[PDB]
Amino acid sequence: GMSAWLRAIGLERYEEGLVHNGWDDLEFLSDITEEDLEEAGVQDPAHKRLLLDTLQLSK
Amino acid sequence: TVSEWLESIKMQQYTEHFMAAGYTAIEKVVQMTNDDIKRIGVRLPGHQKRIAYSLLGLKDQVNTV
């Protein structure tokens, strides 16, 4: 999953939230959209932007 | 195939319940509304969107002759 992934950015505490939506896999989470984010509770602009940053930071 | 859809959206584990509920083929999968989704074995609010959203596309895709 994205346990150590979100750890590097400091979002580890969110993991489980993106688990109840099926984004608990770096198989398709690596190509997640801003739309498919808010559903996991990640509706906030800063949070969405943060996760998008991780897509290129950690990849 | 239903499998490719269910696996691409990371709903892999649902295929089991899906096919068991008679929705083994796309034509039937595009029929089941939101209620069916929740009944077959979907209690997660998030999965209730991953499937529903994608279903909307499938329902429209088959309508696009």
UniProtKB/Swiss-Prot annotation, chain A:
It is found in: Cytoplasm, Cytosol; Cytoplasm, Cytoskeleton; Membrane; Cell projection, Filopodium. Residues 1-59 form the SAM domain. Tyrosine phosphorylated by the members of the SRC family after exposure to a diverse array of extracellular stimuli such as insulin, growth factors such as EGF or PDGF, chemokines, integrin ligands and hypertonic and oxidative stress. May be phosphorylated upon IgG receptor FCGR2B-binding. Widely expressed, most prominently in skeletal muscle, heart and brain. Present in platelets. Expressed in transformed myeloid cells and in primary macrophages, but not in peripheral blood monocytes. The modification Phosphoserine is found at S58. Induction: By bacterial lipopolysaccharides (LPS). Interacts with tyrosine phosphorylated form of SHC1. Interacts with EGFR. Upon stimulation by the EGF signaling pathway, it forms a complex with SHC1 and EGFR. Interacts with cytoskeletal protein SORBS3/vinexin, promoting its localization to the periphery of cells. Forms a complex with filamin (FLNA or FLNB), actin, GPIb (GP1BA or GP1BB) that regulates cortical and submembraneous actin. Interacts with c-Met/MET, when c-Met/MET is phosphorylated on 'Tyr-1356'. Interacts with p130Cas/BCAR1. Interacts with CENTD3/ARAP3 via its SAM domain. Interacts with c-Cbl/CBL and CAP/SORBS1. Phosphatidylinositol (PtdIns) phosphatase that specifically hydrolyzes the 5-phosphate of phosphatidylinositol-3,4,5-trisphosphate (PtdIns(3,4,5)P3) to produce PtdIns(3,4)P2, thereby negatively regulating the PI3K (phosphoinositide 3-kinase) pathways. Required for correct mitotic spindle orientation and therefore progression of mitosis. Plays a central role in regulation of PI3K-dependent insulin signaling, although the precise molecular mechanisms and signaling pathways remain unclear. It is linked to Genetic variations in INPPL1 may be a cause of susceptibility to metabolic syndrome. Metabolic syndrome is characterized by diabetes, insulin resistance, hypertension, and hypertriglyceridemia is absent. Opsismodysplasia: A rare skeletal dysplasia involving delayed bone maturation. Clinical signs observed at birth include short limbs, small hands and feet, relative macrocephaly with a large anterior fontanel, and characteristic craniofacial abnormalities including a prominent brow, depressed nasal bridge, a small anteverted nose, and a relatively long philtrum. Death secondary to respiratory failure during the first few years of life has been reported, but there can be long-term survival. Belongs to the inositol 1,4,5-trisphosphate 5-phosphatase family. It comes from Homo sapiens (Human).
UniProtKB/Swiss-Prot annotation, chain B:
Autophosphorylates. Phosphorylated on tyrosine upon binding and activation by EFNA1. These phosphorylated residues are critical for recruitment of VAV2 and VAV3 and PI3-kinase p85 subunit which transduce downstream signaling to activate RAC1 GTPase and cell migration. Dephosphorylation of Tyr-23 by PTPRF prevents the interaction of EPHA2 with NCK1. Changing T33I: In CTRCT6; reduced protein stability and reduced ability to stimulate cell migration in absence of its ephrin ligand. It is linked to Cataract 6, multiple types: An opacification of the crystalline lens of the eye that frequently results in visual impairment or blindness. Opacities vary in morphology, are often confined to a portion of the lens, and may be static or progressive. CTRCT6 includes posterior polar and age-related cortical cataracts, among others. Posterior polar cataract is a subcapsular opacity, usually disk-shaped, located at the back of the lens. Age-related cortical cataract is a developmental punctate opacity restricted to the cortex. Overexpressed in several cancer types and promotes malignancy. It is found in: Cell membrane; Cell projection, Ruffle membrane; Cell projection, Lamellipodium membrane; Cell junction, Focal adhesion. Receptor tyrosine kinase which binds promiscuously membrane-bound ephrin-A family ligands residing on adjacent cells, leading to contact-dependent bidirectional signaling into neighboring cells. The signaling pathway downstream of the receptor is referred to as forward signaling while the signaling pathway downstream of the ephrin ligand is referred to as reverse signaling. Activated by the ligand ephrin-A1/EFNA1 regulates migration, integrin-mediated adhesion, proliferation and differentiation of cells. Expressed in brain and glioma tissue and glioma cell lines (at protein level). Expressed most highly in tissues that contain a high proportion of epithelial cells, e.g. skin, intestine, lung, and ovary. Residues 1-65 are annotated as: Negatively regulates interaction with ARHGEF16. Residues 1-61 form the SAM domain. Induction: Up-regulated by UV irradiation via a TP53-independent, MAPK-dependent mechanism. This is Ephrin type-A receptor 2. The modification Phosphotyrosine is found at Y14, Y23. Belongs to the protein kinase superfamily. Tyr protein kinase family. Ephrin receptor subfamily.
